Design a protein around this ligand. Structure first.
Ligand SMILES: [Mn+2]
Ligand SMILES: [Mn+2]
Length: 298
């Protein structure tokens, strides 16, 4: 009577209520509502495979980094669920100052539309990184450290890659020298933190590099860079048409690599208030043709 079961439809309403407002306006979610979001989505993440098999049509977004009103802006261009299906590619928290609203809306939509809304792990969906780039501060300030740990236990169960109609391979970062076969991705055990070495690390951290042949060291201090030859060989070996990744700011919101064999998507316009970039959202139709909706910075 005083207690109630958490209602996901009700939480989505309060999250979308600030649509007509200024960036900065928060959303009071109750601490048990957020634990419900984390625990219910965690259960869905664990049931669903760690390598998602998805079907077009689908809209795809890159990094968000707590720019919550840009998340709302993306849904205004793409169609609020369930009007469009979605795949997000990671990096939901840190750097911006409304990571809480950002991840909460995504978890809510994962729970409400579990067969039509999908989110992948990025390298900022790890307790170690997000305790230096902002999400830890934000949870502590607005709630408490124990809630932040509820998020990271959930983050540790996030799927790590996706395949769209056997032809588009999707991940936050890039390829790995240890990616022997897709089965190796399916066997990655959850929950786990992101290691400093190995297949899972590279999937969430590696970068393409136009000026390299093969694999070289990554200036991020972790994982590697790969050249156009690496993408070419992987698509031949795996019989696929496109790698769709995020993880890097790109001026026009999207940017191809190795003769359009790989695309980088970035969905946070005017990233950090510094970069003057657009955001892009990639639309994949049943013919597996890709088009881009562009969100220029306000
Ligand atoms: Mn990022
Ligand atoms: Mn990243």
């Amino acid at each position: 009577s005083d207690s109630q079961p958490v209602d996901v439809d009700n939480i989505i309403d309060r999250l979308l209520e600030v649509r007509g407002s200024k960036p900065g306006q928060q959303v009071d979610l109750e601490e048990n509502e957020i634990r419900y979001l984390c625990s219910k989505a965690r259960s869905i993440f664990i049931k669903q495979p760690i390598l998602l098999e998805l079907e077009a049509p689908i809209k795809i977004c890159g990094d968000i980094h707590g720019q919550y009103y840009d998340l709302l802006r993306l849904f205004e261009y793409g169609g609020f669920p369930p009007e469009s299906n979605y795949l997000f590619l990671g990096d939901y928290v840190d750097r911006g100052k409304q990571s809480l609203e950002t991840i909460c809306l995504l978890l809510a939509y994962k729970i409400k539309y579990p067969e039509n809304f999908f989110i992948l792990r990025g390298n900022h969906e790890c307790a170690s990184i997000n305790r230096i780039y902002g999400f830890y501060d934000e949870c502590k300030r607005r709630y408490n450290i124990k809630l932040w740990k509820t998020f990271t236990d959930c983050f540790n169960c996030l799927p790590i890659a996706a395949i769209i109609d056997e032809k588009i391979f999707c991940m936050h970062g890039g390829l790995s020298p240890d990616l022997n076969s897709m089965e190796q991705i399916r066997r990655v055990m959850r929950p786990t933190d992101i290691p400093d070495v190995g297949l899972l690390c590279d999937l969430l951290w590696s970068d393409p590099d136009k000026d390299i042949v093969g694999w070289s060291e990554n200036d991020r201090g972790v994982s590697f860079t790969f050249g156009p030859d690496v993408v070419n060989r992987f698509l031949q070996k795996q019989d696929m048409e496109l790698i769709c990744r995020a993880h890097q700011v790109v001026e026009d919101g999207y940017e191809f690599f190795s003769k359009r064999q790989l695309v980088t998507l970035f969905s946070a316009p005017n990233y950090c208030g510094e970069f003057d970039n657009a955001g892009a959202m990639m639309s994949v139709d049943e013919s597996l043709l890709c088009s881009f909706q562009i969100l220029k910075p306000a």
